[PDB]
Design a protein around this nucleic acid. Structure first.
Ligand SMILES: [K+]
Ligand SMILES: [Mg+2]
Ligand SMILES: [Mg+2]
Ligand SMILES: [Mg+2]
Ligand SMILES: [Mg+2]
Ligand SMILES: [Mg+2]
Ligand SMILES: [Mg+2]
Ligand SMILES: [Mg+2]
Ligand SMILES: [Mg+2]
Ligand SMILES: [Mg+2]
Ligand SMILES: [Mg+2]
Ligand SMILES: [Mg+2]
Ligand SMILES: [Mg+2]
Ligand SMILES: [Mg+2]
Ligand SMILES: [Mg+2]
Ligand SMILES: [Mg+2]
Ligand SMILES: [Mg+2]
Ligand SMILES: [Mg+2]
Ligand SMILES: [Mg+2]
Ligand SMILES: [Mg+2]
Ligand SMILES: [Mg+2]
Ligand code: NA
Lengths: 125, 197, 144, 68, 145, 96, 229, 49
RNA sequence: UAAGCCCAAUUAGUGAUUGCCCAUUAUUCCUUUGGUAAGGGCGGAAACAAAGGAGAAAGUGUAGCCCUUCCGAUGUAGAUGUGGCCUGGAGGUUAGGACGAAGCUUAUGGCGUGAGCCUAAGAUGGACCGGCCUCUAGUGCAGAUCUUGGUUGGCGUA
RNA sequence: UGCAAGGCCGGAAAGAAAAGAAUUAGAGGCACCAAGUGGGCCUUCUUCGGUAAGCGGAGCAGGCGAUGCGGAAUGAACCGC
RNA sequence: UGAAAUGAGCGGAGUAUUUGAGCUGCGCACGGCGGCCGCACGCACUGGUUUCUUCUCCGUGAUGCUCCAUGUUGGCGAUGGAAAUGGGGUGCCCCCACCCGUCUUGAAACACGGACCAAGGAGUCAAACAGACGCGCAAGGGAGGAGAUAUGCCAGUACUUCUCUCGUACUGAAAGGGAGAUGCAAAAUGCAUCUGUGGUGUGCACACGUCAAAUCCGUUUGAUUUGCCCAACACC
């Protein structure tokens, strides 16, 4: 199946917003934390410091959540789950859950190929 | 940049959706939001605004007040015309002090059981808001009514009771406590009953 | 429940709404009602006038049962009459009997206009209540 | 230690934040309490008479409307 | 007694048919032509409903809720077309008899079912040839009685 | 600095009028990499295969009074290792 | 086919289209006549002034020009460090942003208000060309509290609902001659939002008379605004 | 500057532009210059006497 | 023969009144988000299968019903909101797992402004467990001369 | 039948002309419940004490504090924004 | 890239209308000297003329509620140790760029806590009162304790209420009193009636008209009169 066509995906910013000075402390994860220190140069927005996330970075409503292939990822676990995708199959692709085993995956991939339902993580060919 | 000094002062807090969890209140809000958008009636608009309000701000009404105001309107109304439907977005409560009332059509969100019984036994009928939307879709010949809130205990307790000209009740569990210095001339001073505004 | 409280909203704010300058310290005003005349005087005076001092006579060994004296007004008497009885009631006819003390009332007060003429048995009655109920076709009969 | 006692520096700014509200109109809150007592007593007599005249006027209005 | 309005108010946030996965709200209601979670498409909810389904072979089946026996779940749904090679517009008119507001989606679903049946035929034939090339060390045969 | 706009000094172009003449023309920065990667006409003309590479842009406007020109490169900014190196300004798109 | 209500709607909408086309043609004709009348009035007024000046000059006399009635005021400073009185005046002038521009009547109250905020504004007397350029290129209306670009005469006529203001040239004439609807027309417009003067300023901190920019510069405001518009 | 918009707002703009073009005609311009100068000088000399 | 000081210009006694360079400002375009927001549409329009597609919910809030329009958007202390994120248990409802659950590893990509979610691969593991609605709490760490355990440069040094 | 006060019954009201003859990013009112603050400091004019102070104390107003960005090489507060 | 070409620009028709520039008519304005002059091209007659200068007049609703899909010429791409695009990684370049947390008017500070990592680590529970918001019932609401019997699996759920509580009344230190309206009248407990806002001003909806605007001619959207005025506020 071909996905419905949308306009160009812009992706205002591709760099992640990472925590201040996490590169210096092994225990600090890069997950974003808003700096609240009174002297923080990041919080005070000095020119050369890391940027802070805010609403103006939000994606175009029209291209939001669209994967590079052009589908929107819908998680599915079963063969029966494909039937709610069967009608909107140019909009939603299926993602087989990681814990779904190889045997049930064989069945899911066969049925999805038959239904023309795109799978994000199916068989290559 | 544009100088908007205290522009946030002009923003007004208005309820735009209900906090109620009652599904039937939600159905009525659907009906009257449609009626307020698609008709020219001011009655439908005000009914919608009251429907999304908090319970505290939908004060209950007594049957006697309904009867008295319907009587004041009935005189000076041509006896050819039928009496209006009394409408309250709120609760109708029975009144033991008025045994004899006329036949009245009343629409309310809720009736107390004795209020409904008294209204029916007097010859009138109790309406719901969907029946009213059916027979008065723009609220023609209606009497919109509000219950009273100024006699509320919370209203009686509002404000400092020790300032001149105030007659608010204090927050006190013991009525006999707090009857001394500050409330009697012989105990240092008495808070003044009157002050010119 | 714990998930709806400000503590959940404050995780990561360090000061939890109490400020950097003035902290959250232990008892910065004293405990309870300390200083009602010293450094809490304005609060006590403007919100609880009358709180300090003495007034009136003492009554040692106050028993509330000998003082039991509930009241009901004339325009509320219909609360104590059966629904069918209030209709067969009329001035000059056979009237329902209300015995107050068995309904939990000691005194007939007499505010408003009486709705149903009746004979009322009361321990107490105000003068206006007695006159007003006699004008309406009822009566008061004393009881103990 | 020794520190600053008084200043009015930021106070008119604060007072003007929610503005200086203007006075109540004279036709509101015009209580006559405490004014010259003889005039007050006479005016009360006139007010009682005027209330009676209003009641009679409404009664007559009801009768005349019911006539039609 | 209890309207579709009230039932939709009751089941919208929480229902065994609402599949809220990722941030997407789909429906696995059997009488939903779309998989969309809207009051219009809730065939299990609406007083009158119709859904386009596939049948054995290239047939297309229409299941209809006429609202006359909604208190009887075994009689609630009736199979009415079960015909092969019908025009999609014919399915659309069969659906429009009970729900005209479902005409477009049911037409499209009829076309989609036809496409799916032909595609399944092609894929099955290719898979059969591929299978005919392979030894297949094990083969299960269901017991017959 | 704002790297999305490059400044180019062209020989014999010493007034804003000359730089105006060059507005719109195609501009090329030629360099070499380490390996031989895909080029235009890789299949048609295999003698073009080279470590040599070019980055293309266009003159947008003059800069100053003395013949400097502003240049916008296609998609990406020109690398800073090109500072002080040769730039080709061609005579197309032509207006004469 | 289409049911009763659909056919009702199509009949009504066909009548709507016909009536809208007629209304457009009538409004166009009206705007044409009024623009011709205004153009002739402007030319005749200038010619009469020329003749009056020639006759005064030919006998050793003078012709005192009529006092300008309209000023065009543009703010030339940002929103920092403004004292309360100047802040209040600039808010009442609707000059809340730098290079915001308005038209005001040049009478005594407005004159003293302008004097109080002298270092914040640049102002002068607009020519007809300036008023036209601002209305046509930078003209926006307050329609339902929204800033809406003027794009046709129906928007103007619907906004004002007044026989004397139906087209762009009506607004231009009212503004330019300080007509009896000057306040209605200017109040009905969003404040003009201009670009900085191409070519730059001289000195925003000095008066125009001192070699700066913030004074009353008489009719040279038109050069300034031409570079700004 | 845009043509459709300028004509939409001022339907009369075509005639003002026609007048401006007529004014910028070198023959018309030169003839007007001569005539206006002669006429104004005649008016001045008549008034001064 | 300033690249100094005072004065004055803008390509110069030619023929008119913008030399040039830099902002988180101004104007404008595009996208986001929020309104004291402002308007439309929502009674399926008629027909239409494979060898123009799909959607269209009467709606505070979501992947926001959909479309159009305008305006605002920084912020310490602080307040409030969020079909906002996350963790251990409970009532429900739906699933998954020896064809490999939890845990753990990552130049492992995708999605989200973000809290995070999800997939892939383990040449990891060996038995449980995910989603959604509601309920509940000993529910989120970088620092407290913080507690306990382990490690560590100094150092093959004194 | 004059004065004062409260009403009632009517009439007239450029709804405020003209003379520079206002303007408004001009909905007014009314409440309820709470937080943090209650060490300030700088500048402009006006200043009091002090020889003076980057000193001490006040008035008006803008600021920093709580805020970066552009500029004065550098600077919490200056210029611009 | 024509999946609404709204146009002086597209498609049709006509070779004209009319707007300036000219030089001209009658007054009227306008300037001197006090009606005689002039008049610079002012106003009205949309005057006359046209000597020269313009182009002017019609046309397309959505039976589209929304979104997405349509040109031209090369290069590369023909199913592979692939061509592209995006992401990820490392180095380099030119510009940017003081150490976090904290107290403080002010911290990059020669202010204090700061070797690393794991796990652990701080607004809780209870009671009284208030306000907001949700829910039930309402002049009444509600228990609690405890019994009863389904009940002998089941610390739950179902049922009961004699009472108890706080509200329908609050005043006085207490003894003790205790609140409707209208009408007539003026009795130191006055009579009668009772379907009724105690009165006045300001005040939603609705009902009678009345305007102005816009209208697809159905309507609708602002105001206003009069009546009643709900809630509320202010004087009595
Ligand atoms: K919006
Ligand atoms: Mg991202
Ligand atoms: Mg600081
Ligand atoms: Mg404190
Ligand atoms: Mg102090
Ligand atoms: Mg300068
Ligand atoms: Mg200055
Ligand atoms: Mg916006
Ligand atoms: Mg913010
Ligand atoms: Mg904070
Ligand atoms: Mg636990
Ligand atoms: Mg803990
Ligand atoms: Mg921290
Ligand atoms: Mg406070
Ligand atoms: Mg501080
Ligand atoms: Mg600098
Ligand atoms: Mg310290
Ligand atoms: Mg210090
Ligand atoms: Mg610090
Ligand atoms: Mg130091
Ligand atoms: Mg210390
Ligand atoms: Na840790």
């Amino acid at each position: 199946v071909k996905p419905t066509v949308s306009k160009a995906i812009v992706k205002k910013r591709t760099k992640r917003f990472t925590r201040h000075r996490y590169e210096l402390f092994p225990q600090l994860s890069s997950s974003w934390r808003k700096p609240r220190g009174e002297d923080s140069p990041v919080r005070r927005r000095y020119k050369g410091q890391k940027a802070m996330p805010n609403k103006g970075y939000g994606s175009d409503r029209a291209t939001k959540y669209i994967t590079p292939s052009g589908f929107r990822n819908f998680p599915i676990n079963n063969v029966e789950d494909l039937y709610m995708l069967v009608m909107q199959n140019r909009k939603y692709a299926g993602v087989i859950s990681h814990t779904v085993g190889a045997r049930k995956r064989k069945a899911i991939v066969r049925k999805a190929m038959e239904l023309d339902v795109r799978l994000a993580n199916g068989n290559a060919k | 940049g544009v100088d908007l000094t205290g522009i946030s002062k002009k923003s007004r807090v208005i309820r735009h959706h209900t906090y109620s969890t009652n599904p039937y209140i939600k159905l009525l809000i659907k009906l009257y939001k449609f009626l307020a958008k698609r008709t020219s009636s001011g009655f439908n608009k005000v009914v919608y605004q009251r429907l999304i309000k908090s319970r505290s701000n939908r004060a209950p009404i007594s049957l006697s007040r309904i009867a008295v105001v319907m009587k004041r309107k009935a005189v000076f109304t041509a006896k050819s015309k039928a009496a209006p439907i009394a409408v309250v977005v709120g609760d109708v409560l029975d009144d033991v002090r008025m045994a004899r009332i006329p036949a009245m059509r009343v629409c309310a969100l809720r009736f107390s059981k004795s209020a409904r019984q008294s209204i029916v036994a007097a010859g009138g009928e109790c309406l719901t808001f969907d029946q009213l939307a059916m027979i008065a879709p723009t609220g023609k010949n209606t009497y919109l009514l509000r219950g009273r809130k100024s006699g509320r205990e919370s209203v009686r307790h509002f404000g400092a009771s020790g300032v001149p000209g105030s007659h608010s009740k204090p927050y006190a569990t013991n009525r006999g406590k707090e009857t001394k210095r500050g409330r009697r001339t012989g105990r240092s001073y008495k808070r003044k009953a009157f002050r010119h505004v | 429940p714990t998930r709806f409280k400000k503590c959940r909203h404050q995780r990561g704010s360090t000061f939890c709404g109490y400020g950097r300058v003035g902290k959250h310290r232990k008892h910065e005003s004293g405990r309870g009602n300390a200083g009602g005349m010293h450094h809490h005087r304005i609060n006590f005076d403007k919100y609880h006038p009358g709180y300090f001092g003495k007034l009136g006579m003492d009554h040692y060994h106050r028993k509330k049962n000998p003082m039991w004296k509930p009241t009901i007004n004339l325009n509320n008497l219909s609360r104590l009459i059966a629904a069918e009885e209030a209709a067969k009631a009329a001035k000059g006819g056979t009237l329902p009997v209300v015995d107050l003390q068995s309904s939990g009332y000691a005194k007939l007060l007499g505010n408003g206009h009486i709705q149903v003429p009746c004979i009322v048995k009361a321990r107490y009655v105000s003068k206006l209540a007695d006159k007003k109920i006699r004008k309406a076709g009822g009566a008061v009969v004393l009881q103990a | 230690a020794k520190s600053k006692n008084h200043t009015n520096h930021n106070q008119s700014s604060k007072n003007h934040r929610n503005g200086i509200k203007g006075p109540v109109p004279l036709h509101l809150h015009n209580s006559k309490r405490g004014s010259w007592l003889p005039a007050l007593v006479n005016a009360r007599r006139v007010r009682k008479h005027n209330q009676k005249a209003a009641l009679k006027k409404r009664r007559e209005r009801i009768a005349a409307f019911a006539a039609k | 007694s209890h309207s579709v309005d009230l039932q939709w108010v009751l089941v919208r946030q929480n229902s065994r048919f609402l599949q809220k996965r990722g941030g997407i709200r789909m429906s696995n209601d059997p009488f939903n032509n779309n998989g969309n979670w809207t009051k219009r498409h809730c065939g299990f909810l609406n007083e009158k409903a119709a859904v386009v389904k596939p049948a054995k072979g290239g047939a297309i089946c229409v299941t209809v809720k006429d609202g006359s026996s909604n208190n009887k779940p075994r009689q609630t749904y009736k199979k009415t077309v079960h015909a092969a090679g019908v025009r999609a517009s014919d399915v659309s008119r069969a659906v429009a008899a009970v729900r005209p507001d479902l005409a477009d989606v049911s037409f499209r679903r009829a076309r989609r079912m036809a496409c799916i049946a032909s595609r399944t035929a092609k894929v099955a034939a290719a898979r059969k040839a591929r299978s005919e090339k392979i030894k297949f060390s094990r083969k299960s045969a269901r017991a017959k009685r | 600095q704002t790297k999305q706009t490059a400044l180019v000094r062209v020989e014999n172009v010493n007034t804003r009028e000359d730089a105006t003449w060059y507005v719109g023309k195609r501009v090329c920065y030629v360099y070499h990499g380490k390996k031989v990667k895909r080029c235009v006409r890789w299949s048609k003309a295999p003698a073009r295969r080279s470590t040599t590479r070019a980055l293309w842009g266009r003159v947008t406007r003059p800069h100053g009074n003395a013949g400097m020109m502003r240049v916008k490169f296609n998609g990406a900014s020109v690398p800073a290792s090109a500072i002080g190196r040769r730039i080709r300004v061609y005579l197309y798109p032509s207006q004469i | 086919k289409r049911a009763a209500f659909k056919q009702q709607q199509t009949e009504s909408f066909k009548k709507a289209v016909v009536a809208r086309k007629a209304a457009k043609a009538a409004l166009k004709k009206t705007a044409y006549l009024r623009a011709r009348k205004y153009s002739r009035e402007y030319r005749g007024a200038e010619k009469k002034l020329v003749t009056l000046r020639r006759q005064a000059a030919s006998h050793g006399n003078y012709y005192l020009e009529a006092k300008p009635k309209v000023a065009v005021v543009t703010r030339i400073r940002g929103i920092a460090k403004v004292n309360p009185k100047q802040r209040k005046i600039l808010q009442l002038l609707r000059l809340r942003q730098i290079f915001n521009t308005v038209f005001v009547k040049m009478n005594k109250p407005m004159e003293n208000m302008l004097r109080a905020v002298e270092p914040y504004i640049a102002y002068g007397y607009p020519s007809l060309a300036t008023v036209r350029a601002m209305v046509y290129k930078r003209g926006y209306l307050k329609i339902n509290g929204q800033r809406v670009k003027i794009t046709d005469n129906q928007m103007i006529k619907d906004k004002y609902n007044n026989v004397d203001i139906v087209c762009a040239e009506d607004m231009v004439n009212q503004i330019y001659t300080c007509g009896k609807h000057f306040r209605t027309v200017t109040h009905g417009m969003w404040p003009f939002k201009l670009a900085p003067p191409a070519g730059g300023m001289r000195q925003k901190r000095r008066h125009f008379v001192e070699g700066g920019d913030y004074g009353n510069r008489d009719t040279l405001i038109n050069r300034f605004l031409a570079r700004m518009i | 500057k845009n043509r459709r918009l300028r004509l939409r707002l001022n339907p009369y703009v075509k005639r003002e532009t026609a007048a401006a073009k007529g004014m910028r005609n070198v023959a018309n311009r030169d003839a007007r210059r001569k005539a206006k100068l002669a006429r104004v000088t005649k008016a001045k000399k008549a008034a001064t006497k």
